[PDB]
């Protein structure tokens, strides 16, 4: 039954007549008697008379009580909407190195609004984009820059990264003045690396032989690993400028490998997601090259 | 809040698809997505995955629940003009230990109601409390007191679990005058599923048996296959044919709630009071 319908019954009673019932909903009379009809004709029973005061009928009693059901939940249901969408978390999908790079000062902003609380996926940024577009996270930082059904992309900068070892490794590996890419020990992120996968292209041409591996799943691990010797590695310029800056680590290669990096969020009036995007963009920009 | 595009939304959900809710309701797979979208930018928030099946986001699980509220009121207005008896499906959230012990009364007072249909589903405590929020129940027996989105609670009392085992088995566990628990075989409903305040240092390797019905679970402890937890309901008759002993005058004692739908459905309004009846009569204070 069209609650609508169920509302005007309603005022009519509450407010005694079909005029009080037109002026309190702004509608015509004539309204208010079609709908009434309506509701009528879609139960096959009279539901309240047409004198002043109204009254309703047997069968007209029913939906009027049922009509303040319907209005007391949802006047329920909004108030529960409200207090829950406060306790909810914006959901992220994000890869490691933009989190251990650009990314905390994001947390500053959302601070400061007052209880609300992130949560972050942490994938890379192939896997990145399948959590958007099913809706499990409502924005999402990806290498993807063509927007998925629904949503809207912005560029937030490049990511370099860095072929880097400590001073003694690659002397270790220097034979007759030229370095010995595939004996030198390397770091690897995880189990899947797409990065270490294509790590020797353009450094060495033919079938390569196996290597020696280590594996730290984590950004910051797997810097302290290179940082340590136990490998070379391709590391976020960021992640690598202290280690440069302080001689423990050197540049193997002046060859870097950029990543282009883009902001996708679903698209909704929500002033919560725009603050958060404008926190997200912001960021990169401080911290992504141009 | 528009009250069509709750529909819809719901419709996604029940039929798995958009594609489902636009054969379903028989309007145009554009008018679905026209109608979500609305329905996001009034919360703010995706509501439904994209994916196939079809679910609710955190944010979603409110208003499908809202929306099954509003089903289920519709349903019992229409029973009411109708002038027959309702036949309403109530389909509730309920822990083993409960329904073996004090619940089975409330089957009664259902069937006396005409015609009307219990759905039970045997859930842990976190999957409970998320057919809770999500309305894929509109009842539960919980140990949770916090009441679940869209929800209130009832207290009904308290369900106290004994720790028991054959005088056979426990003598054989007796190592100089002091029982040793770890080495004692336990019983387990389950592989998620109790020495706290029994052993002080680090407990070794246990020795566990699991059976996932109550009553095979008592059965294997009432035949010394192990020593368990028990409600006392349970316990009480092979306490009195000697059956099991108390390993320990201490009871574990676990508050139960019943937690509905916030909602004016005579229907839930008369499942309750069988529900509290019936822990009236079979829990502790
Ligand atoms: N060899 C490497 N440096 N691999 C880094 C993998 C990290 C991955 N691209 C992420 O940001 O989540």
Redesign the interface.
């Known amino acids: 039954?069209n609650?609508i319908q169920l509302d005007t019954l309603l005022s009519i009673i509450d407010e005694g007549s079909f005029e009080g019932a037109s002026l309190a909903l702004s509608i015509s009379p004539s309204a208010v008697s079609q709908r009434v009809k309506a509701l009528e004709h879609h139960?096959g029973?009279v539901l309240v008379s047409r004198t002043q005061p109204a009254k309703a009928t047997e069968?007209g009693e029913?939906?009027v009580q049922?009509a303040r059901?319907?209005v007391?939940?949802?006047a329920?249901?909004?108030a529960?909407?409200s207090?829950?969408?406060a306790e909810?978390p914006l959901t992220i999908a994000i890869n490691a190195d933009s989190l251990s790079t650009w990314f905390p000062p994001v947390f500053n902003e959302v601070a400061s609004w007052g209880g609300a609380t992130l949560t972050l996926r942490l994938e890379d940024e192939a896997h990145t984009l399948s959590l958007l577009?099913?809706?499990?996270v409502?924005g999402a930082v990806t290498r993807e820059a063509n927007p998925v059904?629904?949503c809207e992309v912005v560029e937030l900068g490049t990511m370099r990264h860095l072929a880097i070892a400590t001073p003694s490794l690659r002397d270790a590996y220097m034979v007759d003045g030229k370095l010995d890419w595939a004996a030198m020990p390397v770091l690897r992120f995880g189990p899947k690396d797409v990065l270490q996968d294509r790590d020797l292209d353009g450094r060495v041409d033919g079938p390569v032989g196996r290597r020696r591996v280590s594996i730290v799943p984590s950004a910051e691990g797997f810097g302290e690993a290179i940082r340590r010797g136990l490998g070379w590695g391709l590391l976020p310029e960021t992640q690598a400028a202290p280690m440069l800056k302080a001689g423990e680590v050197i540049l193997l290669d002046e060859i870097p490998i950029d990543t282009p990096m883009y902001w996708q969020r679903?698209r909704?009036?929500?002033?919560?997601?725009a603050r958060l995007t404008d926190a997200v963009v912001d960021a990169a920009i401080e911290g992504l090259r141009p």
Do not use: C, N
Not at 268 to 273: D, V
């Open positions: 039954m609650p139960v029973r069968a029913v939906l049922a059901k319907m007391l939940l949802q329920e249901t909004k529960q909407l207090g829950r969408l909810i577009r099913r809706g499990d409502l059904a629904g679903w909704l009036e929500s002033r919560s997601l």
